[PDB]
Amino acid sequence: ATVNQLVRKPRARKVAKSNVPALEACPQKRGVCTRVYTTTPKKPNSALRKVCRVRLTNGFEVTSYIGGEGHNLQEHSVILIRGGRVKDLPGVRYHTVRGALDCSGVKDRKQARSKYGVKRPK
Amino acid sequence: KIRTLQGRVVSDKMEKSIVVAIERFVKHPIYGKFIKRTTKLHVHDENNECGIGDVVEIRECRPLSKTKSWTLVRVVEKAV
Amino acid sequence: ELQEKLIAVNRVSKTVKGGRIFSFTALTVVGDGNGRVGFGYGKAREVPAAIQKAMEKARRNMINVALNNGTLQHPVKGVHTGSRVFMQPASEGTGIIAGGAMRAVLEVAGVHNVLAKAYGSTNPINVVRATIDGLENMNSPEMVAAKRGKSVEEIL
Amino acid sequence: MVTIRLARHGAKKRPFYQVVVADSRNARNGRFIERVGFFNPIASEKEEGTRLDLDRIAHWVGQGATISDRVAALIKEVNKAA
Amino acid sequence: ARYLGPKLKLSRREGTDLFLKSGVRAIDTKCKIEQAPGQHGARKPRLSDYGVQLREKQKVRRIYGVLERQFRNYYKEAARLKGNTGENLLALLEGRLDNVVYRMGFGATRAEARQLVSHKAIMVNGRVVNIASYQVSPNDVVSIREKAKKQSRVKAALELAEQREKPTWLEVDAGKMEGTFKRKPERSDLSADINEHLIVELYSK
Amino acid sequence: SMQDPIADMLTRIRNGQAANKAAVTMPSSKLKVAIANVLKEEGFIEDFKVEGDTKPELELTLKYFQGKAVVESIQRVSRPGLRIYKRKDELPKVMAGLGIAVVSTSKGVMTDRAARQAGLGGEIICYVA
RNA sequence: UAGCUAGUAGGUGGGGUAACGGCUCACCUAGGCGACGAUCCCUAGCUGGUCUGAGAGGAUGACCAGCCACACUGGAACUGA
RNA sequence: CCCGCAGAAGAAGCACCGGCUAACUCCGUGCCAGCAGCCGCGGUAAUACGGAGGGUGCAAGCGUUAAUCGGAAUUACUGGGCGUAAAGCGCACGCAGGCGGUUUGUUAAGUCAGAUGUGAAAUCCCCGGGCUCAACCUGGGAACUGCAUCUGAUACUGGCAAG
Ligand SMILES: [Mg+2]
Ligand SMILES: [Mg+2]
Ligand SMILES: [Mg+2]
Ligand SMILES: [Mg+2]
Ligand SMILES: [Mg+2]
Ligand SMILES: [Mg+2]
Ligand SMILES: [Mg+2]
Ligand SMILES: [Mg+2]
Ligand SMILES: [Mg+2]
Ligand SMILES: [Mg+2]
Ligand SMILES: [Mg+2]
Ligand SMILES: [Mg+2]
Ligand SMILES: [Mg+2]
Ligand SMILES: [Mg+2]
Ligand SMILES: [Mg+2]
Ligand SMILES: [Mg+2]
Ligand SMILES: [Mg+2]
Ligand SMILES: [Mg+2]
Ligand SMILES: [Mg+2]
Ligand SMILES: [Mg+2]
Ligand SMILES: [Mg+2]
Ligand SMILES: [Mg+2]
Ligand SMILES: [Mg+2]
Ligand SMILES: [Mg+2]
Ligand SMILES: [Mg+2]
Ligand SMILES: [Mg+2]
Ligand SMILES: [Mg+2]
Ligand SMILES: [Mg+2]
Ligand SMILES: [Mg+2]
Ligand SMILES: [Mg+2]
Ligand SMILES: [Mg+2]
């Protein structure tokens, strides 16, 4: 409290811990699909959620969500990942970017097309 | 007129040298408290006449040694 | 001519023997828009009965505030349980910059231009208590001159 | 050594020169010793377009500063105007 | 950069006449003015304070034809200037060339005035100005150029103007199709059912 | 031990006012007598006196209006643990000028308004509103 | 990361630089820095400034300008103001 | 840059619509498919998933991700706490260090006032000028809240002397 005390040991701000360490201050990262599987969600909800294991260009290996209805992905697919947690699925902290290198857009979408890599329907 | 500093002799053992402390008050940049700070200077004297505890007026001069760039002007209150 | 604004409605519960009895609590605040603002709580089994009991209580229990051309006399601090409140007289044209509870109280009070900020708990009932108390404990150049035993200019 | 010359500021197609005295080795738009006038070659009518502190021009030449061809033109023009 | 959508819809949403059509008719005989646009129009929402602040800023923008980026820049400039930000904001809006030309007769609406401006039909101090948002200054003379002076739309616009209220702070010569911007309008000169304090509050939150 | 006697005076005032006491008494000192003088002259107290020679006791008669203390708040600013000095152009005004700040200048202790008008800043002893 | 330091601290004399100086050398004195953080480890070009913030502050140093360092890596010197 | 000609003729997309937050209905599926910044939503009547109609916000852009500051008074000097929510060492002595009853003299160290030098230009800000306006460029001011020196003030802190 005392000024004297602060003069001896200045106030020292806590360093913010990041929520996306595998990206290391990169908006997106590239990575190869090691395995593509489905995992059960947390106890409150219930579903079969599509995830993938991904080895990144920087050595890190992380789990990533594959959003959308339907995907054509397999081992040795190079994909782009972005930040973004899934909450009800522990370990998954990155979101696969649809529309990227080997991520196809979701079929037959009309709303939120830009979030799922879907060309403009003629 | 010559710029000069006043301080006290913390060690006079060296031959023809002395170390003087020119302690000063400075407002703390962040917390406003006025804090004592000390600056130790190697000063040149002839005859090594300055005793520890003396208050001495010193001046800046050309390099006189690896670490001495100040010389003595005069002793103030040579009593110790 | 009185102006009335509903600040918050809340659903409470009493859990009697048989189970929960639900009721509602409407915190409102009336005011004439000229140094006069009465806030009131209203607990009732139904929301309309609550808004009306609250208006009724707020209409009484009303006080006067020594405004200054639609702005405050001097900066003021307000305090109550969790909520510390602070208000400053802004120049003309800015309007009322303040939290919701304070925005409503100052609006109905007639304070046209003020800078405000709430610290700590923003619980509306205590923010309103603390803003009312802040404005009420605020004296005016003539009243301060009378208190101090001199004239106006002698303060300037 | 020390020379009086123009530094081209302004924007594309709208040159604006600041006459400055500086060490000839420094970059054209870099370190200078003193600014002493300006010269707008594209100023519209009624706008002065060219204002030179000719007394400091003198001080510096008196101390051996050279003079660009273009500032020498400006100085002769301003001396002719008035 | 320009709103090309239907007008009366904006008026219906704003629940008020926004002067977005010529005025040959009664707007209530042109649309169901009170009824809100869309299927869920008959019912009214209990609209939060943020809602009223937003809808009011939208009202002013839709009246004058200014999009958000530019309107925000107008707010920053009004705020920087001395005096009441709200009144300075309305002065700045009311000083646009499209606005002044519209309050100077030549055009039934601000859309027509804007088309006239864009199409090099208006001069200020004898120079062709072709940007709608050109800020006109006190003691200016704006005039329709000769080649555009015989356009029948402009004649009709001045007639309709003759049937509208005549704005105080501009001196308009209808014969010469020449007019003068004598002074900046005060707040008391401009309609009193445009509000400002909401707009100043909206941009501080 | 006792290391800020000016804060002590401020506190004796505030506490006697809160306790609706008619007067308060404290060991005297030139600086205290000078602050009481500025306070009295600015109308926050009735009057004051010093009594005794070897242990002079200063006595302040407090001031009330509507059975209320005239002094609403009174706080020490510059204190032994953090001296506060201000320049002429930085001189605070309390309650937007309705109150006063006591400033000690090269020409003695006076109010913020006076020192401002006289062009000399100094050490801000306390605020009174 | 609690001690660090033998050219290390100072003096005398010689040499050397455009210039003062352990810059270098021989000798003598046994010092000097360190809790107001020395030494060690990690990180890092610095500043005018930029963003944010009511302000104090926080983050930052791309472009423009001033300074420093570097030119495959590690050393050396020549010519030359 | 100006002028002439054809003809509305070549030129509108993105996100969202449970609350936070401006904007709702129907159909499809039925704790599946799926959504999600948090709280959450889906188990046959879904304003929260998918589509449609409608509306809202932006606009040659619109969203998503990454990073900083803010909100965060959530490191609090301005501007927080410590009986029970995290927090008073088990207790005491005590060197450095921080603070100091009252009076007088002196000192100009802190302090304050004034002046001089400097604080590059650019940038920020104010008043003007130039580009059809703005962006941009530019004229002149202050401001660089600092540092140094000199001359002054004795209230307060400090030093010295006497109490
Ligand atoms: Mg809190
Ligand atoms: Mg644009
Ligand atoms: Mg030698
Ligand atoms: Mg020699
Ligand atoms: Mg050296
Ligand atoms: Mg590096
Ligand atoms: Mg580097
Ligand atoms: Mg803040
Ligand atoms: Mg670069
Ligand atoms: Mg090399
Ligand atoms: Mg290479
Ligand atoms: Mg050579
Ligand atoms: Mg809503
Ligand atoms: Mg959705
Ligand atoms: Mg069904
Ligand atoms: Mg259904
Ligand atoms: Mg939603
Ligand atoms: Mg849906
Ligand atoms: Mg972000
Ligand atoms: Mg903070
Ligand atoms: Mg706390
Ligand atoms: Mg416990
Ligand atoms: Mg506990
Ligand atoms: Mg204990
Ligand atoms: Mg004392
Ligand atoms: Mg002491
Ligand atoms: Mg002094
Ligand atoms: Mg102009
Ligand atoms: Mg300029
Ligand atoms: Mg500068
Ligand atoms: Mg003394």
Swiss-Prot record, chain A:
Q: Which SUPFAM superfamilies match?
A: Nucleic acid-binding proteins
Taxonomically, the superkingdom here is Bacteria
Q: Keyword check for RNA-binding, yes or no.
A: yes
State one molecular function term (GO).
rRNA binding
Q: Which GO terms describe its biological process?
A: cytoplasmic translation; Group I intron splicing; maintenance of translational fidelity; positive regulation of RNA splicing; response to antibiotic; RNA folding; translation
Modified residues annotated as N6-acetyllysine in this record: K107
**Pfam families referenced in this protein's UniProt entry, alphabetically:** Ribosom_S12_S23 (PF00164)
PROSITE patterns recorded: RIBOSOMAL_S12
CC terms in the record's Gene Ontology section: cytoplasm; cytosol; cytosolic small ribosomal subunit; ribosome
Q: Which residues carry this modification: 3-methylthioaspartic acid?
A: D88
- Extra facts: At least 19 substitutions or deletions in 11 codons can promote streptomycin resistance, dependence or pseudodependence; all but one of the streptomycin resistant mutations (K42R) are associated with hyperaccurate translation and thus reduced translational efficiency.
Q: Which family does it belong to?
A: Belongs to the universal ribosomal protein uS12 family.
**Subunit structure of this chain's protein:** Part of the 30S ribosomal subunit. Contacts proteins S8 and S17. Interacts with ArfA. May interact with IF1 in the 30S initiation complex.
Functionally, this protein is described as follows: With S4 and S5 plays an important role in translational accuracy.
**NCBIfam families this protein is in?**
rpsL_bact (TIGR00981)
UniProt protein name: Small ribosomal subunit protein uS12
UniProtKB/Swiss-Prot annotation, chain C:
Which species does this protein come from? Escherichia coli (strain K12)
Entry text on domains:
The N-terminal domain interacts with the head of the 30S subunit; the C-terminal domain interacts with the body and contacts protein uS4. The interaction surface between uS4 and uS5 is involved in control of translational fidelity.
Task: Tell me the ranges covered by the S5 DRBM domain, including all copies.
Answer: 2-65
Name of the encoding gene: rpsE
Q: What is this protein called?
A: Small ribosomal subunit protein uS5
Q: What else is known?
A: Altered uS5 proteins have been identified in a number of mutants. Some mutations in uS5 have been shown to increase translational error frequencies.
Q: Can you state the subunit structure given in the record?
A: Part of the 30S ribosomal subunit. Contacts proteins uS4 and uS8. With proteins uS4 and uS5 encircles the mRNA as it enters the ribosome, which may play a role in mRNA helicase processivity. Can be cross-linked to mRNA. In collided ribosomes contacts ribosome rescue factor SmrB.
Query: Which residue spans adopt a coiled-coil conformation according to this UniProt entry?
Result: none
* A single MF term (Gene Ontology): rRNA binding
SUPFAM superfamilies documented for this protein: dsRNA-binding domain-like, Ribosomal protein S5 domain 2-like
**Its function?**
With uS4 and uS12 plays an important role in translational accuracy. Many suppressors of streptomycin-dependent mutants of protein uS12 are found in this protein, some but not all of which decrease translational accuracy (ram, ribosomal ambiguity mutations). Located at the back of the 30S subunit body where it stabilizes the conformation of the head with respect to the body.
Family of this protein: Belongs to the universal ribosomal protein uS5 family.
UniProtKB/Swiss-Prot annotation, chain E:
Question: Which NCBIfam families has this protein been placed in?
Answer: PRK05327.1, rpsD_bact
**How is the quaternary structure described?**
Part of the 30S ribosomal subunit. Contacts protein S5. The interaction surface between S4 and S5 is involved in control of translational fidelity.
Name of this protein: Small ribosomal subunit protein uS4
The record's family statement is: Belongs to the universal ribosomal protein uS4 family.
InterPro entries registered for this protein in UniProt: Ribosomal_uS4, Ribosomal_uS4_bac-type, Ribosomal_uS4_CS, Ribosomal_uS4_N, S4_RNA-bd, S4_RNA-bd_sf
Q: What does this protein do?
A: One of the primary rRNA binding proteins, it binds directly to 16S rRNA where it nucleates assembly of the body of the 30S subunit.
Q: Where on the tree of life does the source sit, at the highest rank?
A: Bacteria
The lineage, from the top, is: Bacteria, Pseudomonadati, Pseudomonadota, Gammaproteobacteria, Enterobacterales
Q: What sections of the protein cross the membrane?
A: none
- Species source reads Escherichia coli (strain K12 / MC4100 / BW2952)
Where the record annotates domain S4 RNA-binding, the positions are: 95-155
Q: Name one GO molecular function term.
A: structural constituent of ribosome
Curated annotation (Swiss-Prot), chain F:
User: What keyword terms does UniProt attach to this protein?
Assistant: Repressor, Ribonucleoprotein, Ribosomal protein, RNA-binding, rRNA-binding, Translation regulation
Cite the InterPro entries for this sequence: Ribosomal_uS8, Ribosomal_uS8_CS, Ribosomal_uS8_sf
GO annotation, biological process: cytoplasmic translation; regulation of mRNA stability; regulation of translation; ribosomal small subunit assembly
| Gene Ontology terms for molecular function | rRNA binding; structural constituent of ribosome
Gene3D superfamilies, sorted: 3.30.1370.30, 3.30.1490.10
Q: For this UniProt entry, what's an example GO CC term? A: cytosolic small ribosomal subunit
Q: Pfam families from the entry?
A: Ribosomal_S8
Q: What does this gene product do?
A: One of the primary rRNA binding proteins, it binds directly to 16S rRNA central domain where it helps coordinate assembly of the platform of the 30S subunit.
Instruction: Give the family, as the similarity comment puts it.
Output: Belongs to the universal ribosomal protein uS8 family.
Summarize subunit and interaction data from the UniProt record for this chain: Part of the 30S ribosomal subunit. Contacts proteins S5 and S12.
Entry protein name: Small ribosomal subunit protein uS8
